């Protein structure tokens, strides 16, 4: 009457594929050991709570967004502020850096992810195009090219935007709950999104249909990051745990959790080799997880408030982390 | 020595941007940020002045910036925390709505839903020490309606006089009873839709009292 039998068939089919857990395969892998992560560069200047951080392609420029209506682009090596943009909507909750480094996007509790053009003959960061069309707050806006950007909004819909046209190229509405985070695959042909329904779905950019769904989490998913190989991605939720999902298996291989960790996860990122999972927690600390053996290889406390954002460079040399304490600290 | 000419210029630019950011933060520090919730919200906003609506109004040498978070049907457990540090919360409820059921085959009563929202926000972990400026709107319609249809339908266990004063007092007491942390925060209740800018006067007085009490809680005199 209402597709009762269909749900069980998928469950049985996915169950039949379980042969060996990821833990068994990684038993012979030598432990990474304690990582002597130490703060190297400290960034300050936006007083309000920092909510979003993203590295540039050059691995030296990163963009941060704060609740004081300011997004700051930082020179990672020298800590020099290169740009400070006054946001008309001060409730920014996400930001991104274009692959070419020419454009920057940010979104908040408003229903717009304004596109900022860094490279202008007038030499100022002016609003290029406003991607209005959402009914809820924007959770994450990640660029595909200089003209295409994918946006995640609290209205449960993800929209592909053509910057020049300013209209949604493709709308994804498969999520029942609000989508909180957006992660792009290395090839950019597909992306995955996490939602408050404790599930994540695989989206194909060029066609616009869900290809896979993941439901291992118990609570709202907050952050997601693609594994560097592109065949897997990690999820972070309010369960105080993060999970690894593989696109070719549709199953969770392993979970990253500890007994003494009870608060939710706000951020997640991978190292260039993919052996380390950079996860930001609400206990003011970041835990480095051995992606293979699923063990804590290090801890970055660094902050006096909740870790709100973090990311690894394209070169994989340094990891930046932001927190509601209004500071971003870069570690190596 | 270790920095080149371009490095020196970049450092100068960085410290200039830092100065500008600090100036902007100082300017924003002297702004009273208020959270608005609700039910006569449009009338309240008109008398005070698809995402978050921000309104700025200056009253008696003080700056108020009100954040109406309406039209955000999305789950607020993921963005309610963005409003930490707000001086006070303005909650709007229409008294005349005791006889409405919000359609949906009358699955709920509008007043009951309003008080459920009030309880959820008051007991929220992010506002354990935030005052609430409660507004009871549509008093004239409430009187006109109770003159014919008793409020007992909305409150089956309420047995008392149907006059406006008693019903309004009972509703105000019911709203205040939702406060499970009454010691930490107060609830300033006012009746509107029959009052001119003096609603702004009530808001200003409540904010002033909240500020004074917060200052005292610093010294230990309150």
């Amino acid at each position, epitope marked *: 009457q209402e597709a009762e039998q269909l749900k069980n068939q998928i469950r049985d089919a996915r169950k039949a594929c379980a042969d060996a857990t990821l833990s068994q395969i990684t038993n012979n892998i030598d432990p990474v050991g304690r990582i002597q992560m130490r703060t190297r560069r400290t960034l300050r200047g936006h007083l309000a709570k920092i909510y979003a951080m993203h590295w540039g392609t050059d691995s030296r420029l990163l963009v941060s967004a704060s609740q004081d209506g300011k997004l700051i682009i930082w020179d990672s090596y020298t800590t020099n502020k290169v740009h400070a943009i006054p946001l008309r909507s001060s409730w920014v909750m996400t930001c991104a850096y274009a692959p070419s480094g020419n454009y920057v996007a940010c979104g908040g509790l408003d229903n717009i992810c304004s596109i900022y053009n860094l490279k202008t003959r007038e030499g100022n960061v002016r609003v290029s195009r406003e991607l209005a069309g959402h009914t809820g707050y924007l959770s994450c806006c990640r660029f595909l090219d200089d003209n295409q950007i994918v946006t995640s909004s609290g209205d449960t819909t993800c929209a592909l935007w053509d910057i020049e046209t300013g209209q949604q190229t493709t709308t994804f509405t498969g999520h029942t709950g609000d989508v909180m985070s957006l992660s792009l695959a290395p090839d950019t042909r597909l992306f995955v999104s996490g939602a408050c329904d404790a599930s994540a779905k695989l989206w194909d950019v060029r066609e616009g249909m869900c290809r896979q769904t993941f439901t291992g989490h118990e609570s709202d998913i907050n952050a997601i990051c693609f594994f560097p190989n592109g065949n897997a991605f990690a999820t972070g939720s309010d369960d105080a745990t993060c999970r690894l999902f593989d696109l070719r298996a549709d199953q969770e291989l392993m979970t990253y959790s500890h007994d003494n960790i009870i608060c939710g996860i706000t951020s997640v990122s991978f190292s260039k080799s993919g052996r380390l999972l950079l996860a930001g927690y609400d206990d003011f600390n970041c835990n480095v997880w051995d992606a293979l053996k699923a063990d804590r290889a290090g801890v970055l406390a660094g902050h006096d408030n909740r870790v709100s954002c973090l990311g690894v460079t394209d070169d994989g040399m340094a990891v930046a982390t932001g927190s509601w304490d209004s500071f971003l600290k870069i570690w190596n | 020595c270790t920095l*080149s000419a371009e490095d020196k*210029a*970049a450092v*100068e630019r960085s410290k*200039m941007i830092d100065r500008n950011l600090r100036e902007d933060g100082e300017k924003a520090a002297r702004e009273v940020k208020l959270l608005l919730l609700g039910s006569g919200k449009n009338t309240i906003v008109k008398q005070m002045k698809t995402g978050i609506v921000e309104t700025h109004f200056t009253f008696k040498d003080l700056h108020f910036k009100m954040f109406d978070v309406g039209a955000q049907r999305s789950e607020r457990k993921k963005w309610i925390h963005c409003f930490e540090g707000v001086t006070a919360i303005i909650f709007c409820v229409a008294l005349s709505d005791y006889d409405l059921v919000l359609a949906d085959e009358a699955e709920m009563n509008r007043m009951h839903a309003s008080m459920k929202l009030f309880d959820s926000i008051c007991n929220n972990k992010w506002f354990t020490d935030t005052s609430i400026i409660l507004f009871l709107n549509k008093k004239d319609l409430f009187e006109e309606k109770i003159k014919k249809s008793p409020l007992t339908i909305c409150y089956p266990e309420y047995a008392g006089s149907n006059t406006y004063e008693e019903a309004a007092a009972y509703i105000q007491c019911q709203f205040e009873d939702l406060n499970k942390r009454k010691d930490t925060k107060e609830i300033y209740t006012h009746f509107t839709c029959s009052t001119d800018t003096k609603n702004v006067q009530f808001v200003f007085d409540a904010v002033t009292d909240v500020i004074i009490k917060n200052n005292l809680k610093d010294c230990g005199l309150f």
Partner: single-chain antibody
Amino acid sequence: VQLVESGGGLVQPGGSRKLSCSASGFAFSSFGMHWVRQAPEKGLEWVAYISSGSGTIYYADTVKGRFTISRDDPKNTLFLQMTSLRSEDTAMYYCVRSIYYYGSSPFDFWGQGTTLTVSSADIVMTQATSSVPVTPGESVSISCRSSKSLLHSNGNTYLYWFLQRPGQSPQLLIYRMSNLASGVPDRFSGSGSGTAFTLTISRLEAEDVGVYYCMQHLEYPLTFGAGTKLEL
């Protein structure tokens, strides 16, 4: 973006004249400003620098003291006070805007300049040939040398290449020896060692003819070579 200079004219020796440049179409406050002179039938020479906010001000040894530079951010105009003009000061000054941050392109825009008719550890930049006859469609190479290693400890080689076509202001081509300037044909390429550098054109075009200039930004006493004049 557009920079218009003013105040040019004939001034007798010992007089004082102020050159004013108007900034329109870009954020004047964000960009620092430079003054580069060009004596008639001669090469370029850096004059003075003023940073955003007037925090940092520098002058060349031959002009230090006599010439002072001030900025007016509210009005988006630049002033360069000049006192006790000498016969050597007879040159046309070109105002240049630069912004300093990783990935930036300093000296990316040059103004028309203002014509003025009057009457030590510094790195010396030399170019291999003052003039070179060339033909369209064939590869062309221009080489220059520096008396000191321009490769700073940070790992960036501060080499700048410029092209000044006849009856036109210089146009930036290469700013750090490896990066092509914005709005320039991809034909131009930059390469070199820590002290020897070469500017090569994969295939010459009619618009490439002109005088090419080299500069180092390792230290503020900027030095401009005699130039390399290409003739078709």
